[PDB]
């Protein structure tokens, strides 16, 4: 329906003053145990502090700056046929897209603590050096190249 959100407001991180670090713990946490996620955020930043050339205060933002697309491909029905169309990636999602991919990667991993599973993906999330890892972005590379019918 129509008379719906939008985006509900969230309160920014009390220690860092950031709304990205507030959304990050909300999607990172599991079974609503946000208190454990508050021990994983910044604890996963241990090996990134000196390695960040934007300084520590952008050592996580850098992994979200790596990917900021304008369109994504979707496969949608027009009748008895189903075709690939480009849909807009708005400012509200443009900064939260890669954040959602990094937590999935860490949850799908199974070695060390969670604060080390998260650090494995975050170490390469602005380097992209691994094999078959940029297949992640084919859903936006196929969108900046959509032809469809007009």
């Amino acid at each position: 329906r129509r008379r719906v959100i939008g985006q509900r407001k969230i309160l920014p991180d009390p220690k860092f003053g950031s709304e990205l670090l507030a959304k990050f713990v909300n999607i990172l946490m599991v079974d609503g145990k946000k208190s454990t996620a508050e021990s994983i955020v910044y604890s996963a930043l241990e090996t990134l502090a000196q390695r960040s050339g934007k300084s520590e205060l952008e050592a996580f933002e850098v992994a979200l700056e790596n990917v900021r697309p304008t369109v994504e491909v979707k496969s949608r029905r027009v009748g008895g046929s189903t075709y690939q169309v480009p849909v807009e990636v708005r400012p509200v999602r443009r900064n939260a897209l890669a954040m959602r991919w990094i937590v999935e990667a860490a949850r799908k991993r199974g070695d060390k603590s969670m604060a080390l599973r998260l650090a494995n993906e975050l170490s390469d999330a602005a380097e992209n050096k691994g094999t078959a890892v940029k297949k992640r972005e084919d859903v936006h590379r196929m969108a900046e190249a959509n032809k469809a019918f007009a």
Partner: protein, 127 residues
């Protein structure tokens, strides 16, 4: 001269008192950093306080009882807003900007027939 405000949330209730001129920060006969707001919600009572701040311009005194400590915090936040929105006539514009003047009454949804654990139709994880 003293300013007063009240707030209630989830079986808890708070009373807040403020004096002009820099001084103490008291809650339940202890300091505001002495036992309260150490868990998962922490800074909820300080959300409106950041618009004036502690050890800066006022003397603060709180009394709170009932329920759990996060319900207490969401009650204190309204009670301190009610006091601060008469402490200065241009501070109130900023409390209605941050939306701390709005009174929350969300509580929980009530059950109906035929439903399960407070909510939801008799359930099947498959088919």
């Amino acid at each position: 001269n003293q300013y007063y405000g009240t707030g209630r949330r989830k079986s808890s209730a708070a009373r807040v008192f403020i004096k002009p001129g820099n001084g103490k920060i008291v809650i339940n006969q202890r300091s505001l950093e002495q036992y309260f707001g150490r868990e998962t919600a922490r800074m909820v009572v300080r959300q409106p306080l950041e618009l004036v701040d502690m050890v800066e311009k006022l003397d603060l005194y709180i009394t709170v009882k009932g329920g759990g400590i996060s319900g207490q915090a969401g009650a204190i936040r309204h009670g301190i807003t009610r006091a601060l929105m008469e402490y200065d006539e241009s501070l109130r514009s900023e409390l209605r900007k941050a939306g701390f003047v709005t009174r929350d009454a969300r509580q929980v949804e009530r059950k109906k027939v035929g439903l399960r654990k407070a909510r939801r139709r008799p359930q099947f994880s498959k088919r």
